[PDB]
Design an enzyme around this catalytic site. Structure first.
Site, PDB file in Angstrom:
ATOM      1  N   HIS A   2     -21.055 -18.914   2.515  1.00 10.08           N
ATOM      2  CA  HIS A   2     -20.896 -20.276   3.005  1.00 10.08           C
ATOM      3  C   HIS A   2     -19.554 -20.468   3.711  1.00 10.08           C
TER       4      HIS A   2
ATOM      5  N   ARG B   3       6.126  -6.454  19.496  1.00  9.77           N
ATOM      6  CA  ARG B   3       5.579  -5.684  18.385  1.00  9.77           C
ATOM      7  C   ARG B   3       6.051  -6.327  17.078  1.00  9.77           C
ATOM      8  N   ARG B   4       6.586  -7.542  17.183  1.00 10.75           N
ATOM      9  CA  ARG B   4       7.103  -8.293  16.040  1.00 10.75           C
ATOM     10  C   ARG B   4       6.332  -9.593  15.794  1.00 10.75           C
TER      11      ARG B   4
ATOM     12  N   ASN C 242     -12.269 -13.173   2.768  1.00 10.04           N
ATOM     13  CA  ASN C 242     -11.036 -12.850   3.495  1.00 10.04           C
ATOM     14  C   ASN C 242     -11.258 -12.442   4.950  1.00 10.04           C
TER      15      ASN C 242
ATOM     16  N   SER D  17      -4.310  -6.366  -2.733  1.00  7.58           N
ATOM     17  CA  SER D  17      -5.333  -6.264  -3.765  1.00  7.58           C
ATOM     18  C   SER D  17      -6.615  -6.837  -3.188  1.00  7.58           C
TER      19      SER D  17
ATOM     20  N   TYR E 197     -15.222  -4.708  -9.846  1.00  7.10           N
ATOM     21  CA  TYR E 197     -15.218  -4.881 -11.295  1.00  7.10           C
ATOM     22  C   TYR E 197     -16.422  -4.169 -11.893  1.00  7.10           C
TER      23      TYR E 197
ATOM     24  N   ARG F 132      -5.189  -6.813 -15.067  1.00  6.24           N
ATOM     25  CA  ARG F 132      -4.362  -7.590 -15.998  1.00  6.24           C
ATOM     26  C   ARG F 132      -5.097  -8.108 -17.227  1.00  6.24           C
TER      27      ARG F 132
ATOM     28  N   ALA G 123     -15.107 -12.222 -16.019  1.00  6.69           N
ATOM     29  CA  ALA G 123     -14.709 -12.342 -17.416  1.00  6.69           C
ATOM     30  C   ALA G 123     -13.477 -13.246 -17.412  1.00  6.69           C
TER      31      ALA G 123
ATOM     32  N   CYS H  62      -2.439 -12.151  -1.989  1.00  5.79           N
ATOM     33  CA  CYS H  62      -3.218 -10.919  -1.830  1.00  5.79           C
ATOM     34  C   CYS H  62      -3.119 -10.506  -0.366  1.00  5.79           C
TER      35      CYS H  62
HETATM   36  C1  LIG Z   1      11.484   1.407  14.844  1.00  6.73           C
HETATM   37  C2  LIG Z   1      12.317   2.262  13.825  1.00  6.73           C
HETATM   38  F1  LIG Z   1      12.953   1.425  12.874  1.00  6.73           F
HETATM   39  N1  LIG Z   1      13.819  -0.256  12.660  1.00  6.73           N
HETATM   40  C3  LIG Z   1      14.264   1.008  12.696  1.00  6.73           C
HETATM   41  N2  LIG Z   1      14.167   1.816  11.624  1.00  6.73           N
HETATM   42  C4  LIG Z   1      14.703   3.045  11.538  1.00  6.73           C
HETATM   43  O1  LIG Z   1      14.554   3.825  10.414  1.00  6.73           O
HETATM   44  C5  LIG Z   1      15.427   3.487  12.688  1.00  6.73           C
HETATM   45  C6  LIG Z   1      15.487   2.589  13.778  1.00  6.73           C
HETATM   46  N3  LIG Z   1      16.094   2.848  14.814  1.00  6.73           N
HETATM   47  C7  LIG Z   1      16.705   4.145  15.092  1.00  6.73           C
HETATM   48  C8  LIG Z   1      17.189   4.800  13.834  1.00  6.73           C
HETATM   49  C9  LIG Z   1      17.268   6.247  13.954  1.00  6.73           C
HETATM   50  N4  LIG Z   1      15.840   6.562  13.986  1.00  6.73           N
HETATM   51  C10 LIG Z   1      15.398   7.720  14.459  1.00  6.73           C
HETATM   52  C11 LIG Z   1      15.473   8.936  13.764  1.00  6.73           C
HETATM   53  C12 LIG Z   1      15.154  10.128  14.449  1.00  6.73           C
HETATM   54  C13 LIG Z   1      14.764  10.112  15.808  1.00  6.73           C
HETATM   55  C14 LIG Z   1      14.752  11.299  16.644  1.00  6.73           C
HETATM   56  O2  LIG Z   1      14.979  11.211  17.861  1.00  6.73           O
HETATM   57  N5  LIG Z   1      14.528  12.493  16.059  1.00  6.73           N
HETATM   58  C15 LIG Z   1      13.428  13.440  16.357  1.00  6.73           C
HETATM   59  C16 LIG Z   1      13.335  14.352  15.168  1.00  6.73           C
HETATM   60  C17 LIG Z   1      13.140  13.642  13.830  1.00  6.73           C
HETATM   61  C18 LIG Z   1      13.198  14.581  12.652  1.00  6.73           C
HETATM   62  O3  LIG Z   1      14.274  15.166  12.402  1.00  6.73           O
HETATM   63  O4  LIG Z   1      12.171  14.743  11.986  1.00  6.73           O
HETATM   64  C19 LIG Z   1      13.629  14.245  17.653  1.00  6.73           C
HETATM   65  O5  LIG Z   1      14.776  14.655  17.934  1.00  6.73           O
HETATM   66  O6  LIG Z   1      12.639  14.423  18.399  1.00  6.73           O
HETATM   67  C20 LIG Z   1      14.598   8.868  16.440  1.00  6.73           C
HETATM   68  C21 LIG Z   1      14.908   7.678  15.777  1.00  6.73           C
HETATM   69  C22 LIG Z   1      15.485   5.953  12.691  1.00  6.73           C
HETATM   70  N6  LIG Z   1      16.195   4.635  12.705  1.00  6.73           N
HETATM   71  N7  LIG Z   1      14.922   1.405  13.770  1.00  6.73           N
HETATM   72  C23 LIG Z   1      11.446   3.338  13.164  1.00  6.73           C
HETATM   73  O7  LIG Z   1      11.739   3.793  12.055  1.00  6.73           O
HETATM   74  N8  LIG Z   1      10.317   3.822  13.789  1.00  6.73           N
HETATM   75  C24 LIG Z   1       9.855   3.381  15.008  1.00  6.73           C
HETATM   76  O8  LIG Z   1       8.882   3.924  15.532  1.00  6.73           O
HETATM   77  N9  LIG Z   1      10.588   2.338  15.596  1.00  6.73           N
HETATM   78  C25 LIG Z   1      10.550   2.166  17.053  1.00  6.73           C
HETATM   79  C26 LIG Z   1       9.434   1.337  17.482  1.00  6.73           C
HETATM   80  C27 LIG Z   1       9.684   1.123  18.875  1.00  6.73           C
HETATM   81  O9  LIG Z   1       9.397   2.380  19.578  1.00  6.73           O
HETATM   82  C28 LIG Z   1      11.173   0.739  18.983  1.00  6.73           C
HETATM   83  C29 LIG Z   1      11.390  -0.680  18.584  1.00  6.73           C
HETATM   84  O10 LIG Z   1      10.835  -1.698  19.498  1.00  6.73           O
HETATM   85  P1  LIG Z   1      10.431  -3.071  18.832  1.00  6.73           P
HETATM   86  O11 LIG Z   1      10.051  -4.136  19.800  1.00  6.73           O
HETATM   87  O12 LIG Z   1       9.259  -2.728  18.031  1.00  6.73           O
HETATM   88  O13 LIG Z   1      11.521  -3.517  17.963  1.00  6.73           O
HETATM   89  O14 LIG Z   1      11.704   1.604  17.858  1.00  6.73           O
HETATM   90  C1  LIG Z   2      -6.500 -12.120  -4.417  1.00  2.00           C
HETATM   91  C2  LIG Z   2      -6.922 -13.341  -3.525  1.00  2.00           C
HETATM   92  F1  LIG Z   2      -5.782 -14.082  -3.123  1.00  2.00           F
HETATM   93  N1  LIG Z   2      -4.075 -14.689  -3.706  1.00  2.00           N
HETATM   94  C3  LIG Z   2      -5.251 -15.303  -3.515  1.00  2.00           C
HETATM   95  N2  LIG Z   2      -5.667 -15.655  -2.285  1.00  2.00           N
HETATM   96  C4  LIG Z   2      -6.765 -16.384  -2.025  1.00  2.00           C
HETATM   97  O1  LIG Z   2      -7.140 -16.699  -0.738  1.00  2.00           O
HETATM   98  C5  LIG Z   2      -7.515 -16.803  -3.166  1.00  2.00           C
HETATM   99  C6  LIG Z   2      -7.023 -16.396  -4.427  1.00  2.00           C
HETATM  100  N3  LIG Z   2      -7.570 -16.708  -5.482  1.00  2.00           N
HETATM  101  C7  LIG Z   2      -8.846 -17.413  -5.554  1.00  2.00           C
HETATM  102  C8  LIG Z   2      -9.022 -18.343  -4.391  1.00  2.00           C
HETATM  103  C9  LIG Z   2     -10.421 -18.617  -4.103  1.00  2.00           C
HETATM  104  N4  LIG Z   2     -10.814 -17.312  -3.572  1.00  2.00           N
HETATM  105  C10 LIG Z   2     -12.088 -16.946  -3.514  1.00  2.00           C
HETATM  106  C11 LIG Z   2     -13.002 -17.416  -2.559  1.00  2.00           C
HETATM  107  C12 LIG Z   2     -14.370 -17.109  -2.722  1.00  2.00           C
HETATM  108  C13 LIG Z   2     -14.824 -16.342  -3.820  1.00  2.00           C
HETATM  109  C14 LIG Z   2     -16.218 -16.278  -4.221  1.00  2.00           C
HETATM  110  O2  LIG Z   2     -16.521 -16.123  -5.414  1.00  2.00           O
HETATM  111  N5  LIG Z   2     -17.165 -16.432  -3.273  1.00  2.00           N
HETATM  112  C15 LIG Z   2     -18.223 -15.461  -2.904  1.00  2.00           C
HETATM  113  C16 LIG Z   2     -18.698 -15.868  -1.539  1.00  2.00           C
HETATM  114  C17 LIG Z   2     -17.601 -15.960  -0.480  1.00  2.00           C
HETATM  115  C18 LIG Z   2     -18.096 -16.510   0.834  1.00  2.00           C
HETATM  116  O3  LIG Z   2     -18.501 -17.693   0.876  1.00  2.00           O
HETATM  117  O4  LIG Z   2     -18.093 -15.763   1.816  1.00  2.00           O
HETATM  118  C19 LIG Z   2     -19.395 -15.403  -3.899  1.00  2.00           C
HETATM  119  O5  LIG Z   2     -19.803 -16.469  -4.408  1.00  2.00           O
HETATM  120  O6  LIG Z   2     -19.867 -14.282  -4.193  1.00  2.00           O
HETATM  121  C20 LIG Z   2     -13.868 -15.799  -4.695  1.00  2.00           C
HETATM  122  C21 LIG Z   2     -12.511 -16.092  -4.548  1.00  2.00           C
HETATM  123  C22 LIG Z   2      -9.837 -17.256  -2.469  1.00  2.00           C
HETATM  124  N6  LIG Z   2      -8.557 -17.708  -3.099  1.00  2.00           N
HETATM  125  N7  LIG Z   2      -5.938 -15.674  -4.581  1.00  2.00           N
HETATM  126  C23 LIG Z   2      -7.772 -12.887  -2.331  1.00  2.00           C
HETATM  127  O7  LIG Z   2      -7.819 -13.561  -1.298  1.00  2.00           O
HETATM  128  N8  LIG Z   2      -8.501 -11.719  -2.381  1.00  2.00           N
HETATM  129  C24 LIG Z   2      -8.513 -10.857  -3.453  1.00  2.00           C
HETATM  130  O8  LIG Z   2      -9.256  -9.874  -3.446  1.00  2.00           O
HETATM  131  N9  LIG Z   2      -7.679 -11.207  -4.527  1.00  2.00           N
HETATM  132  C25 LIG Z   2      -7.998 -10.719  -5.874  1.00  2.00           C
HETATM  133  C26 LIG Z   2      -7.425  -9.407  -6.134  1.00  2.00           C
HETATM  134  C27 LIG Z   2      -7.664  -9.201  -7.530  1.00  2.00           C
HETATM  135  O9  LIG Z   2      -9.098  -8.930  -7.701  1.00  2.00           O
HETATM  136  C28 LIG Z   2      -7.248 -10.511  -8.228  1.00  2.00           C
HETATM  137  C29 LIG Z   2      -5.766 -10.602  -8.355  1.00  2.00           C
HETATM  138  O10 LIG Z   2      -5.140  -9.648  -9.291  1.00  2.00           O
HETATM  139  P1  LIG Z   2      -3.652  -9.238  -8.960  1.00  2.00           P
HETATM  140  O11 LIG Z   2      -2.988  -8.426 -10.016  1.00  2.00           O
HETATM  141  O12 LIG Z   2      -3.783  -8.423  -7.756  1.00  2.00           O
HETATM  142  O13 LIG Z   2      -2.881 -10.447  -8.667  1.00  2.00           O
HETATM  143  O14 LIG Z   2      -7.662 -11.480  -7.139  1.00  2.00           O
END
Ligand SMILES: *C1=C(F234[N][C@@]25=N3C(=O)C2=C(N=[C][C]3[C]N(C6=[C][C]=C(C(=O)[N][C]([C][C]C([O])=O)C([O])=O)[C]=[C]6)[C]N32)N54)C(=O)[N]C(=O)N1[C]1[C][C]([O])[C]([C]OP([O])([O])=O)O1
Ligand SMILES: *C1=C(F234[N][C@@]25=N3C(=O)C2=C(N=[C][C]3[C]N(C6=[C][C]=C(C(=O)[N][C]([C][C]C([O])=O)C([O])=O)[C]=[C]6)[C]N32)N54)C(=O)[N]C(=O)N1[C]1[C][C]([O])[C]([C]OP([O])([O])=O)O1
Lengths: 264, 264
Positions: free
Chosen positions: B51, B126-127, B177, B167, B209, B21, B263, B146
């Protein structure tokens, strides 16, 4: 796909036993990331036959901010039937959050348009994000979004996208999720006069149901074929003007399909 | 740290030029994931002196849902001064979203307590997610978060956590991070009678950079020392009852600190 089979094997060899909300056990790993160079071909699984038809309709359905399955039904797509209520409503899921995230002060944010704006006027932004994880509306959704957050990135005329998937059924859902998001990137890129880059997939709880082991071993024995090519017949007026017929997949020769029954 | 130096080198060798930017160029890569087995030691960078003091205060400040820098000031922590307004307010940033995500119907959701509940009553979920990316309040925040989304996972008595950072300033922010989130996992685990597992870090636009190249090369020449050990003097009543003095880091022998000018 090479990256796909690799994950399946990984879950098999490194997954720990964990049960899901029902009772079906799963082999689960936490944290995995894959990268698909979209320039290398359309990431549609070839080790088993996948049908783009439902994938396309669902994506176009998401884009229209529709949360009622009627459109899907008019096109005989029944993938959401399981979750829809008596009236065909699913609650404020994906489409609603993407196109009309409600604010506390009464506004409805269009995240898809916001993203189009950024990609065209500020491609260097690190905030080009679309989130479906609206904490305040989770209780009303048929189910919490799996693919809950995605971010775009532009570099050297190439549009890339990273998806964070909180829960991932490797065998049943992932193939569908990859193609779905890969399609979105091609559409967005076309609308922004950008080349397609990478599609990075990041997963949280990545798993395989215990009753899908045979199908997994079977698929793992198949050799991945070359990836097909996605053809977009025409360039619509806006991202909201795509039509099912506008897409065509070229060079897709997968292995036979594989059924995956689910417990209830 | 081994994983840390590896990323720095990666950004150096594979990063593309991109401006931020302001006007400062950066070497940027999109999509990266690291894993820290928390059982292997506290992930505090040893290739340069870090640190924990400011890190601890900021975390405790986040947990109290405070968005005004007064608490930080009472403890001479000035890392947020740069963003605070005349009154010391930063807007509905982290702490506010974590402890009181506002709903369209007038409620304020406590995501931290929700998570504690899940970990204790439904660890297989898995959520178990905490999001600071409140689309409707972005315009009022001093800056878009970021580290915007994190998810917990329980398996074999071990609590793991994945953070998605949109980024990431590799040299200046990442070390901070990682330690910040690693601390959170230890606190959560203690409160849920769980062992600590992995801390998976996922980044979007990961960069360095252009004016930090020397410091980067310098740090890269240093050999990572063994990781320290985090000591929690006592087990508080709740997650909201921790005190700065409750933490103690044992066995931390880093290399000299390295300044990184920015810079304006
Ligand atoms: C998840 C998934 F996601 N959210 C969501 N998205 C989408 O996109 C989808 C869903 N569901 C269901 C529906 C329909 N699908 C499908 C398609 C296709 C298939 C079959 O069977 N086929 C084959 C062939 C293919 C071609 O053509 O290539 C045979 O036949 O073999 C099946 C299905 C889409 N949609 N929903 C996605 O995407 N991915 C994945 O992997 N996933 C899964 C994960 C696990 O395994 C389950 C869930 O659990 P959690 O806990 O994680 O929620 O699913
Ligand atoms: C992005 C980033 F993010 N959103 C945010 N988050 C955070 O966490 C942060 C930010 N900003 C700033 C603040 C502070 N930081 C920092 C820390 C530290 C540093 C330094 O310098 N240090 C070193 C050492 C370390 C240790 O101790 O280990 C030396 O001295 O060498 C710096 C900084 C944090 N916070 N904001 C993150 O996280 N990461 C990344 O990588 N990022 C970046 C990317 C790029 O490069 C920029 C942005 O652009 P855009 O378009 O993408 O938006 O930034």
């Amino acid at each position: 796909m090479k990256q796909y089979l690799e994950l399946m094997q990984k879950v098999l060899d490194e997954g720990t036993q964990k049960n899901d909300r029902t009772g079906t056990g799963t082999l689960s790993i936490f944290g995995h990331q894959m990268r698909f160079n979209l320039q290398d071909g359309f990431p549609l699984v070839t080790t088993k036959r996948c049908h783009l038809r439902s994938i396309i309709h669902e994506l176009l359905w998401f884009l229209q901010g529709d949360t009622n399955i009627a459109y899907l039904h008019e096109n005989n797509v029944t993938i959401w039937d399981e979750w829809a209520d008596e009236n065909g409503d699913l609650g404020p899921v994906y489409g609603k959050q993407w196109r009309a995230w409600p604010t506390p002060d009464g506004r409805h944010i269009d995240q898809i348009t916001t993203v189009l704006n950024q990609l065209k006027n500020d491609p260097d932004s690190r905030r080009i994000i679309v989130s479906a994880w609206n904490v305040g509306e989770l209780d009303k959704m048929a189910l919490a979004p799996c693919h809950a957050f995605f971010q775009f990135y532009v570099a050297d005329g190439k549009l890339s996208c990273q998806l964070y998937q909180r829960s991932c059924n490797v065998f049943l859902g992932l193939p569908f999720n990859i193609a779905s998001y890969a399609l979105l990137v091609h559409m967005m890129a076309q609308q922004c006069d950008l080349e397609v880059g990478d599609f990075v997939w990041t997963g949280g709880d990545t798993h395989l149901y215990s009753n899908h082991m045979d199908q997994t071993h079977l698929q793992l024995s198949r050799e991945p074929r070359p990836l097909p090519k996605l053809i977009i017949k025409r360039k619509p007026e806006s991202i909201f003007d795509y039509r099912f017929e506008d897409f065509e997949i070229e060079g897709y020769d997968p292995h036979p399909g594989i059924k995956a029954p689910v417990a209830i």
